[PDB]
Design a protein around this ligand. Structure first.
Ligand SMILES: Nc1ncnc2c1ncn2[C@@H]1O[C@H](COP(=O)(O)OP(=O)(O)OP(=O)(O)O)[C@@H](O)[C@H]1O
Ligand SMILES: [Mg+2]
Length: 222
């Protein structure tokens, strides 16, 4: 019942987040193309595998990929440069490509089976990524009347995700490209000098500053 926190790799971003992204919660990162959403996802997929005194949860990962932007060699690089075995780290990320939004929804149901399989194991699922949460919905539900229909399907999908996060004490991390029912929304944008900036949105009771980070051979870090 106590929540867990997964470090992002960036001390700055971690502080903004109160220590890292939370289990029993959906964290949505949103921003324009190139703002670092997928790179943050790759980094979290390594960080969660660390022990807790290093900011992880000794956990496995389920990743639902909608745009085929998952890169196993990037996982291996991030792992290697953080002192972890690249191939063991990869072994604990279960990637499924979602062919369309309906398949994406079924995949969340299959994720529950894998979650059960690894539960009470030494590396239970502690992170579930959906990258991108919205891309299929955006292409499939379009035109007059689509707004209500799309929002309803997305709400159902997010309800499924919330249930997994809460039932099994998992952190859910979803991405959304810009030009809501997530627990926490984090807006990401590219700044000067290769920096990325993060801001919490519509969360008046949480830190109101901005975090600043870089994307490196370690994934994300200050
Ligand atoms: N190995 C690396 N080292 C340093 N920077 C990198 C590396 N790989 C990617 N990047 C940076 O990450 C950027 C891409 O970030 P990312 O794919 O997370 O964007 P995104 O927000 O997911 O975009 P979209 O919405 O288009 O999918 C690149 O333009 C580059 O600046
Ligand atoms: Mg991306």
């Amino acid at each position: 019942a106590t929540i867990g926190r997964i470090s992002t790799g960036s001390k700055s971003l971690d502080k903004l987040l109160g220590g890292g992204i939370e289990t029993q919660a959906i964290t949505e990162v949103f921003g324009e193309f190139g703002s670092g959403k997928t790179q943050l996802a790759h980094t979290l997929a390594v960080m969660v595998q660390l022990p807790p005194e290093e900011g992880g949860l000794n956990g496995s990962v389920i990743w639902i990929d909608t745009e085929n932007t998952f890169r196993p060699e990037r996982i291996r690089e991030i792992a290697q440069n953080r002192g972890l075995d690249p191939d063991e780290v990869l072994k604990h990320i279960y990637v499924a490509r979602a062919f369309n939004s309906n398949h994406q929804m079924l995949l969340v149901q299959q994720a529950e089976d894998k979650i059960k399989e690894l539960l009470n194991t030494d590396r239970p699922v502690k992170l579930l990524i959906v990258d991108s949460l919205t891309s299929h919905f955006r292409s499939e539900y379009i035109g007059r009347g689509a707004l209500a229909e799309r929002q309803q399907k997305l709400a159902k999908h997010l309800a499924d995700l919330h249930r997994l996060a809460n039932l099994y004490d998992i952190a859910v991390f979803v991405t959304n490209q810009v030009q809501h029912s997530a627990t926490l929304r984090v807006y990401l944008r590219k700044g000067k000098g290769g920096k990325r900036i993060a801001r919490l949105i519509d969360a008046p009771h949480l830190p109101e500053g901005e975090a600043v980070f870089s994307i490196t051979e370690k994934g994300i870090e200050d």
